[PDB]
Design a protein around this ligand. Sequence first.
Ligand SMILES: NC(=O)c1ccc(N)nc1
Ligand SMILES: NC(=O)c1ccc(N)nc1
Lengths: 239, 239
Amino acid sequence: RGSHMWIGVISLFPEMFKAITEFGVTGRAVKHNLLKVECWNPRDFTFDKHKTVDDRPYGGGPGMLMMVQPLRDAIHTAKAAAGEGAKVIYLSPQGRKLDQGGVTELAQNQKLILVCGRYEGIDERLIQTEIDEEWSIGDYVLTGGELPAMTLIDAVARFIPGVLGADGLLDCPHYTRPEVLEGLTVPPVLMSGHHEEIRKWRLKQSLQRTWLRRPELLEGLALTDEQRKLLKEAQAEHN
Amino acid sequence: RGSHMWIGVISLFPEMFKAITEFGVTGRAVKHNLLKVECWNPRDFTFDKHKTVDDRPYGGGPGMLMMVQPLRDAIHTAKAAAGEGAKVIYLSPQGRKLDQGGVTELAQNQKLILVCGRYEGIDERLIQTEIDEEWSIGDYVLTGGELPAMTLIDAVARFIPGVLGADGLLDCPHYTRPEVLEGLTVPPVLMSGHHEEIRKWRLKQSLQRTWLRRPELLEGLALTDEQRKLLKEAQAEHN
Ligand SMILES: NC(=O)c1ccc(N)nc1
Ligand SMILES: NC(=O)c1ccc(N)nc1
């Protein structure tokens, strides 16, 4: 469709990506051609009898690396399919830390190619010669780049028009039926039908929750007059 | 086995979890009974004809929330299956930010229950009454908690003995065959077979890469004498 997104994926385990292409909001996006996810498996680019996709690191060490030739050939094939303009991304803990601002940046691309490493990762020279950007989804280590790739895909998919049916703050609390749950009642303001009061309450809650849980996030913001007031109110009430 | 881990999962899309239970290192862990992942679907705890799992938020707004009764009943069932000692975790951007230290903390639990929200999330009172800890995998918004749950599972699985076949720094570069790749050569030290020189080179590279890419990570460390020296060397060479 309009701001259709195409994402090429290089992975030894392409079936993992069914988790986003077959279910939920992202599954719908794929079915409706708002999002296309296309996978290439380095194992298909091997030539030896046992289809070897790993190789030993120079200098020794416990682990293995992705074998260069099958991975390189898979990447080249994905690039040829993408045509001009596709940004190639490698997922790793050494990459730029993903946050919502970074998601909105990545979402500007009509085409992405995501390279998923396994084992101890990929040859440094491939990063230099084939990768445009290195990204991390957070400061922790996983068994492979597939979950980070899927996480990135899901996050950017939300910005594709038609996929869905924030302002630097944590979300406010939400309530649904029943009116009373284990003695806990819904805040009366949410029952009032006073849409302006409800708005300000939610905003105040978001400011309070951000202040108590993630105060560093507030330092990155230029609060509006209204937000400054409601935050001061919340801090006074907290005291 | 020994430090076997059991993880209960509450999700509207349990088939997504095949991505970790059927493939790779985590698939092996599950097959070998080092890791058990057990899923309950709130849709199975509905009683109406159309198996409704969402509900309208008090106070209005665009989105929907998880319906309380099916979700609550699924959680209670998972808790009964887990028996005593299981920590219940809700995945959301309002939670404690996951990092490797937090992974090692979570890995100390023999039993976890992971609640995956969809839509605009779950009722605040359920968080108060059913959830022990809220965790986030990073400062970005996804369509549901399943990818964060899987990310958490993968990260903690790596600490289960037998699953695998770091010190605050980014990883060093890695090289494998061929010796020359698009004119780019493997660092001679890695070919030298001098294991002490190789160690120090890798450590120096990790310190240099951490300094250039993530200097804030260094401020959280008490560097060893050796690390202080190699970092000073790298910074001098960089200049
Ligand atoms: N933090 C990450 O984005 C990441 C990427 C790959 C991997 N094996 N582990 C972690
Ligand atoms: N950052 C997170 O851990 C997260 C959890 C749930 C969701 N829908 N989006 C993001």
